[PDB]
Swiss-Prot record:
Coiled coil: none annotated. The chain holds residues 1 to 89 of 161 of the full protein. GO terms for molecular function: actin filament binding; calcium ion binding; calcium-dependent protein binding; protein homodimerization activity; troponin I binding; troponin T binding. Troponin is the central regulatory protein of striated muscle contraction. Tn consists of three components: Tn-I which is the inhibitor of actomyosin ATPase, Tn-T which contains the binding site for tropomyosin and Tn-C. The binding of calcium to Tn-C abolishes the inhibitory action of Tn on actin filaments. Residues 16-51, 52-84 form the EF-hand domain. The keyword Phosphoprotein applies. It comes from Homo sapiens. One of its GO terms (cellular component) is troponin complex. Keywords: Acetylation, Calcium, Cardiomyopathy, Disease variant, Metal-binding, Muscle protein, Phosphoprotein, Repeat. It is linked to Cardiomyopathy, dilated, 1Z: A disorder characterized by ventricular dilation and impaired systolic function, resulting in congestive heart failure and arrhythmia. Patients are at risk of premature death. Cardiomyopathy, familial hypertrophic, 13: A hereditary heart disorder characterized by ventricular hypertrophy, which is usually asymmetric and often involves the interventricular septum. The symptoms include dyspnea, syncope, collapse, palpitations, and chest pain. They can be readily provoked by exercise. The disorder has inter- and intrafamilial variability ranging from benign to malignant forms with high risk of cardiac failure and sudden cardiac death. This is Troponin C, slow skeletal and cardiac muscles.
Amino acid sequence: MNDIYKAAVEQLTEEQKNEFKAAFDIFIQDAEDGCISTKELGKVMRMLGQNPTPEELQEMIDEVDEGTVDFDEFLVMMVRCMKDDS
Ligand SMILES: [Ca+2]
Ligand SMILES: [Ca+2]
Ligand SMILES: [Ca+2]
C-alpha cells in the first residue's frame, strides 16, 4: 500500500483496524465487492462513532481518493475524522 496512507494507518491499533474492518464489511457484498459508495461512507463512519459533515465527506473524497471508497481509503478518512473531535 501507498506510504502516505501508511502515515495515516500507523496511527491505528490492531483492535481498531479489526473493529473498522468489521464495520466496513457490513456495507459490501464480501464475495464480490471491494468498495462502498460515497453515501455509505458517512454511514460507516457514524457506525464507528464519527460525525462527518457532508462538506467534509466531499473534501475527503476529493483529497484522499486514489464515487467509491475501498478499505484503505476508508481507514485514512477515519483517521482524519478521528482528529476533529472536540
Ligand atoms: Ca476497541
Ligand atoms: Ca474488539
Ligand atoms: Ca466490537
